[PDB]
Amino acid sequence: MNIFEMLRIDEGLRLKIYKDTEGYYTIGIGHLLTKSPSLNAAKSELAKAIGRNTNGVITKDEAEKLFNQDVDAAVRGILRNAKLKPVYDSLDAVRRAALINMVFQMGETGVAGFTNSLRMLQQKRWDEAAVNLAKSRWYNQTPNRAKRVITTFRTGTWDAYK
């Protein structure tokens, strides 16, 4: 298992514009298009993302390409953020994947907001950090995904995904 297969399990793949859990227009493997309510603002963003007129639908290849870019952005965002980088540096390979996942879903800003949990992860206090991470809107709104990520941080293995 690796970050790509992990995110593919969590986000799934859809080839036609859909609404995410928050109700925002998305496509492919969790690629957010706009927080705007307009399906048209959605289609325009999509065409700009793909480089072509698409009318709401993309191919598998186009989806995976947006996916590669988004994972790359996720990592670069962490490496550039003063709060996230030290945490990431401090973790093993599996747990690193778990932080990437959170960033992919909620953005650098959001994750950066979990100050206490981040301090706990840096300190390697696994159980305490798992407990703190669960007291969040994140855990409340997407509990099954949140549990999977959390378990990854607690254990440092891929078991929740196997």
Known catalytic residues are 11, 20
Q: How many residues bind Cl ion (CB under 5 A)?
A: 4
List of residues 6+ apart from 50 with CB closer than 8 A? 58, 62, 66
- Asked if 95 touches Cl ion (CB under 5 A), the answer is no
Is 53 near Cl ion (CB under 5 A)? no
Residue 7 makes contact with Cl ion by CB under 5 A: no
Quote the least distance from Cβ 25 to Cl ion, whole Å.
13
Query: Residue 36 gets which letter from DSSP?
Result: S
Q: Letter for the amino acid at 97?
A: A
- Judging by beta carbons within 10 Å of its beta carbon (0-12, 13-18, 19+), is residue 130 exposed, middle or buried? buried
Q: H helices of the chain, where?
A: 3-11, 39-50, 60-80, 84-90, 93-112, 115-122, 126-134, 137-141, 143-155
Residue from 51, 92, 144, 162 that binds Cl ion (CB under 5 A)?
A: 144
- Quote the least distance from Cβ 5 to Cl ion, whole Å: 18
CA–CA distance, 112 with 70 (Å, rounded to integer):
18
Cβ nearer to Cl ion, comparing 43 with 145 = 145
142 forms part of the interface with Cl ion (CB under 5 A)? yes
Under the binding rule (CB under 5 A), the answer on residue 71 touching Cl ion is: no
The residue count of the chain comes to 162
- Cβ distance to Cl ion smaller for residue 109 or 123: 109
Asked if 49 touches Cl ion (CB under 5 A), the answer is yes
Shortest separation between residue 142's beta carbon and Cl ion, angstroms: 4
51 φ/ψ angles, rounded to the nearest 5 degrees: 80, 25
Residue 145 binds Cl ion, judged by CB under 5 A: yes
Which residues of this protein are in contact with Cl ion, per CB under 5 A?
49, 142, 144-145
